[PDB]
Design a protein around this ligand. Structure first.
Ligand SMILES: C[S@@+](CC[C@H](N)C(=O)[O-])C[C@H]1O[C@@H](n2cnc3c(N)ncnc32)[C@H](O)[C@@H]1O
Ligand SMILES: C[S@@+](CC[C@H](N)C(=O)[O-])C[C@H]1O[C@@H](n2cnc3c(N)ncnc32)[C@H](O)[C@@H]1O
Lengths: 49, 1024, 49
């Protein structure tokens, strides 16, 4: 699953296609701003505040 | 290039004259309706491999066979079939003649549709009487069928100015048709219904009719000269199955058959015989919205347009079509590849190019457009197919001016070889055994036994046993013992005694035989006994009785020949007992066993007689023992050598036993033994460099065979890579004989090139700097089918000619004379210079002969200079720089060409060579060395006019003696050191003839030596 | 397989013998045809197939 080329399309075509669909069209995580850090502070530990 | 299968470029042709049509009258219908023996309306088709009638092609009167085969019920055999057809058509003839009087209806045209439908209805018993009023036509052929009122929908029906009619059965299938691979294809024209042809008068009305009508399978037009008026043909959805790997449908088969028929007609156009129709191609008209690109209907529409324009196929088509050929053609056309031709299939009209040779535009008012836009660059000519050969033929190269690097050609030939294969070996040495003899003389010399040579110490090693076993496995004979015995007896009965005057051995001899073996694939005895007893040798007298002893007798007795045994006393005794079986592989016990065999064979000799002893391993102890013991008790002797297998064994023959005398060894015997041992050493050194008997070749061997096999599709200028590969093979071969073969292999036209390499070839590959390239034209012209054979290592089975053997002798003399790093020059090489394989790689050359050469100019490491200025003339040698000049087999030719004497020609040569800067020189001269024997059939002299008269070549040359040659040489230079090199009895020259993979001879090498003694080579050093 | 592009590559011996034996026995030989041309060694295609 982590390397696609170990699945031959001769032996498992639709399963190789499903691996392609996962590795190309899985949703990308993004990031958004909230709050007021400048006077509220922020309790964000690992992320930037 | 090509579309998908290769079409023949660089030419295009088409027929020109078209026959004027002929109206089909009632008298013609009657003459076709009865079946004369000269002509009948059916032609039989036949199978290719069995010559059996399996199908019948039909013609004009019987073409309305649209019903099922069960409705007719024909017999399966062709003779009963045609007899049934003759009888039933005669019944129909009587019916139609009873209806219509011939005398009043002689010269009116009959109706073709009614004729075909009438025959088809009468053969099917389907109420044919309502067709008989429609048989005589009026006002046109088509309007009677339109405006008629007789209701018969089995054959035709009208839709209003458009008549449809069900055509059928161009071909007819027999019972023995079984879809075999050599059966003729029928193109789905034997079914009940393959198409429905719609007839009318105008194409606008036809196109208005096909608005509401479907065009699923696609329609087909004809546009040239249709069968019965202007019409379209719509094929149905039936399939063709008599083509195995793929199934095509009806209109596909019609378009394919007419495209192949037009491809047939484009080749056979001769510009004076007329054809019945200029093009038979269809050019599909409406179905192109349903059949699209890369489909088989589209691709055959493309090929149909190309056939109409007049292209030709790259490979020839058969006279009778086969299912394998049709399968191969369609399998070629469904592949990958773009349309390379500018001709694209249209939809509005069939287009023809500007310079297409077809004249169909002049004989047709509607359909064709001379497009001035697109042009075809290829020239106009017909096809010229050369006639194929079953055997591979020889090829010779011709070079060009371009050049590449050597390693690129080496990489390309490594890509193109099929070299890991097992070639057939052949035979090194063919013929009867050579015979080398020497006899005792009283007045030569007395020598001691310690001075005579012996075996080399490196004799029983692995490489030496390898060389001897290779030579013994490759040398082809009949019976070894028979040939050896004939040689030793013919050289034994020549001896004469010094006591009396006649000879030693006579008839009625009562001989004994030692060392008898049983198995010889004949009688259970050695094969010399009964022909020598019957006198069939005819150089011998027959003995009185032969008794045979040894370990392996069949008609004698088994004894141990070492120590004595009860027997009689025999007046002659021939012994072969050898020291391999009883000797335990050591020279001491072998020599002691030789001494014991000599003791037994001397004590069993019945004094006043003779004996013959073989010796495998002649060593110093053996020579010392025989000199101490045997020679004082022997009147005279000789020791001879039959040469069949490479080993050091000799024969000893002694005459006149048990008389007190004084005999020793002589200097002639010493010379014979030195020659014998050096001959063994040279031939073993040659045999240790050859590959094994049944080897496979990998390329690492210094001699062997190599092939390449690259493919050539049709007529095409070959690419850079093929030219580099073939030129690299030529540089690797080095002007040996090269044979090619062109054949279809697994659906691909491919050619092979087969030749051999040599150490002289490796020397020539070390000579040059850049790899030159060949002219590929001599291979591009070839359109044959040259069937190959399995490769062999020794191709020459008849052996080498004595001229070739003499040439190899002179080549070995040149290669031995020329040192390393020395400027040379040659007189008269020829178109190719053989001396390039002789001189070393660092030595520069400058050959000169009148004929223009063929070896390439430029691309050498060292200086090579080619020039043609008649070297015998004067005024050229001043600028020429050389150290040694060589004239081989050309001075006599120049003397015969100038029609002048040999002395004057040699004097002119030495006058022009005085101006040079060379100091050593050797040239071939025509001089009698020994007394003349005037060799029968190879060199018959003229004693009066002094000519040579070579009968194999038809040439004659003047000569003179060594006295005159030495006179002119000493008149030229006072300090010249004249010498005459002797011939090679030791066969030291055989290196160049065996390493270049040539089976030599026996009789021709004897004739070559006896020819070399009458025209030797002299060497001149002008100093010293 | 086209011969003109697959002329000079080595073929697989196991797949060849099994293909002949399956075609003579009519035992669904079509899934052997992709394994006929070999790569990276003779044995690892049969292992990792
Ligand atoms: C002399 S050679 C080969 C002779 C050859 N077959 C011929 O027919 O002329 C070896 C043969 O000599 C025979 N022979 C008889 N007495 C022998 C002995 N004392 N030592 C060696 N070989 C002997 C062996 O049986 C053996 O077949
Ligand atoms: C090919 S040779 C034969 C000898 C050759 N070296 C060999 O070993 O076979 C014969 C050639 O010698 C050339 N030749 C003979 N006399 C000549 C002359 N006076 N001047 C120039 N060339 C001559 C001829 O042109 C002819 O092609």
């Amino acid at each position: 699953f982590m390397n696609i080329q170990l699945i031959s399309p001769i032996d498992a075509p639709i399963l190789r296609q499903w691996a392609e669909i996962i590795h190309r069209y899985w949703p990308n995580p993004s990031q958004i701003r909230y709050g007021t850090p400048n006077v509220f502070g922020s309790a964000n530990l690992f992320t930037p505040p | 290039a090509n579309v998908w299968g290769v079409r023949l470029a660089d030419s295009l042709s088409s027929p020109t004259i078209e026959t004027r049509t002929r109206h089909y009258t009632l008298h013609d219908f009657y003459s076709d309706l009865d079946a004369s023996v000269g002509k009948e309306p059916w032609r039989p088709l036949r199978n290719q491999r069995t010559n059996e009638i399996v199908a019948v092609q039909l013609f004009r009167p019987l073409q309305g066979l649209v019903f099922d085969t069960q409705l007719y019920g024909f017999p399966g055999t062709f003779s009963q079939w045609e007899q049934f057809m003759k009888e039933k058509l005669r019944v129909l003839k009587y019916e139609v003649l009873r209806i219509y009087p011939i005398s009043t209806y002689n010269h009116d045209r009959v109706n073709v549709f009614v004729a075909n439908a009438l025959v088809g209805a009468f053969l099917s018993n389907q109420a044919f009487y309502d067709l008989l009023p429609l048989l005589i036509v009026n006002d046109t052929m088509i309007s009677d069928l339109l405006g008629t009122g007789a209701a018969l929908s089995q054959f035709f029906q009208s839709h209003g100015e458009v008549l449809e009619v069900a055509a059928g059965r161009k071909y007819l299938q027999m019972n023995n048709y079984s879809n075999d691979d050599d059966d003729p294809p029928l193109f789905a024209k034997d079914l009940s219904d393959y198409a429905k042809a719609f007839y009318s008068d105008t194409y606008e009305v036809l196109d208005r009719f096909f608005w509401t009508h479907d065009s699923s399978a696609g329609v087909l037009v004809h546009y040239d000269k249709p069968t019965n008026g202007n019409h379209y043909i719509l094929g149905t959805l039936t399939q063709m199955v008599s083509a195995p790997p793929h199934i095509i449908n009806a209109t596909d088969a019609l378009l394919l058959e007419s495209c192949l028929e037009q491809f047939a007609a484009n080749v056979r156009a001769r510009s004076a015989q007329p054809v019945t129709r200029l093009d038979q191609c269809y050019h599909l008209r409406w179905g192109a919205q349903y059949v699209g690109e890369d489909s088989l209907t589209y691709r055959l529409g493309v090929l149909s347009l190309l056939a109409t324009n007049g292209y030709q196929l790259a490979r020839p088509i058969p006279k009778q079509l086969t299912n394998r050929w049709l399968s191969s053609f369609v399998s070629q056309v469904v592949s990958d590849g773009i349309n390379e031709t500018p001709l694209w299939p249209q939809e509005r009209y069939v287009q023809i190019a500007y310079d297409s040779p077809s004249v169909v535009d002049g004989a047709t008012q509607y359909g064709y457009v001379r497009r001035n836009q697109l042009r075809l660059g290829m020239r106009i000519s017909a096809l010229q197919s050369l006639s194929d050969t079953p055997a591979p033929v020889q090829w010779l190269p011709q070079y060009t001016i371009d050049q590449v690097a050597v390693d690129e050609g080496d990489a390309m030939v490594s890509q193109l070889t099929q070299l890991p294969l097992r070639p057939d070996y052949g035979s090194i040495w063919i013929g009867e055994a050579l015979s080398y003899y020497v006899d005792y003389n009283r007045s030569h010399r007395v020598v001691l036994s310690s001075e005579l040579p012996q075996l080399p110490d490196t004799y029983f090693d692995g490489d030496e046993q390898y060389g001897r076993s290779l030579f013994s496995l490759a040398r082809k004979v009949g019976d070894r013992s028979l040939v050896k015995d004939t040689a030793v007896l013919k050289h034994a009965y020549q001896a004469i005694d010094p006591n009396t005057g006649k000879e030693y051995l006579r008839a009625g001899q009562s001989v004994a035989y030692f060392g008898a073996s049983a198995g010889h694939s004949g009688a259970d005895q050695p094969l010399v006994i009964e022909p020598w007893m019957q006198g069939k040798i005819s150089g011998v007298p027959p003995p009185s009785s032969v008794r045979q002893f040894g370990y392996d007798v069949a008609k004698g007795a088994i004894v141990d020949l070492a120590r004595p045994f009860p027997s009689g006393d025999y007046q002659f005794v021939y012994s072969d007992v050898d020291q391999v079986v009883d000797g335990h592989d050591d020279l001491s016990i072998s020599s002691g066993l030789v001494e014991s065999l000599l003791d037994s064979c001397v004590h069993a000799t019945a004094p006043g007689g003779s004996f013959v002893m073989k010796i495998n391993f002649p060593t110093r102890t053996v020579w010392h023992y025989i000199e101490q013991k045997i020679l004082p008790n022997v009147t005279s002797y000789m020791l001879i050598k039959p040469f069949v297998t490479n080993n050091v064994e000799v024969f000893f023959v002694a005459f006149g036993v048990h008389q007190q005398s004084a005999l020793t060894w002589t200097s002639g015997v010493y010379f014979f033994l030195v020659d014998h041992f050096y001959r063994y050493e040279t031939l073993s050194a040659i045999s240790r460099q050859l590959p094994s008997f049944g080897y496979v070749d990998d390329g690492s061997s210094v001699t062997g065979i190599e092939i390449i096999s690259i493919e050539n599709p049709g007529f095409s200028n070959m690419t850079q890579a093929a030219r580099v590969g073939i030129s690299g093979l030529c540089a690797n071969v080095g002007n040996a004989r090269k044979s090619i073969a062109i054949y279809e292999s697994h659906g691909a036209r491919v050619l092979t090139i087969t030749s051999r390499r040599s150490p002289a070839s490796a020397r020539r590959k070390a000579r040059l700097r850049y790899l030159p390239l060949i002219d590929p034209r001599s291979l591009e012209v070839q359109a044959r089918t040259i069937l190959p054979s399995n490769p062999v290592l020794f191709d020459n089975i008849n052996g080498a000619s004595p001229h070739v053997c003499l040439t190899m002798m002179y080549n070995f003399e040149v290669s031995s004379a020329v040192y390393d790093g020395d400027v040379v020059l040659d007189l008269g090489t020829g178109p190719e210079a053989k001396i390039l394989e002789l001189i070393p790689s660092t030595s520069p050359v400058t050959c000169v002969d009148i004929r223009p050469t063929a070896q390439p100019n430029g691309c050498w490491n060292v200086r090579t200079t080619f020039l043609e200025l008649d070297y015998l003339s004067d005024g050229w040698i001043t600028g020429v720089r050389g150290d040694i000049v060589t004239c081989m087999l050309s001075l006599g030719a120049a003397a015969a060409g100038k029609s002048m004497t040999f002395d004057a020609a040699f004097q002119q040569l030495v006058r022009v060579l005085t101006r040079s800067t060379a100091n050593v020189l050797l040239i071939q001269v025509n001089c009698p060395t020994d007394v003349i024997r005037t060799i029968k059939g190879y060199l018959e002299i003229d004693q009066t006019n002094k000519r040579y008269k070579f009968p194999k070549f038809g040439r004659d040359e003047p000569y003179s003696d060594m006295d005159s040659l030495e006179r002119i040489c000493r008149a030229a230079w006072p300090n010249c050191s004249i010498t005459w090199v002797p011939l090679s009895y030791d066969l030291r020259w055989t290196k160049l003839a065996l390493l270049e993979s040539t089976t030599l001879s026996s009789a021709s090498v004897r004739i070559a030596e006896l020819m070399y003694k009458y025209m030797p080579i002299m060497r001149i050093d002008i100093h010293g």
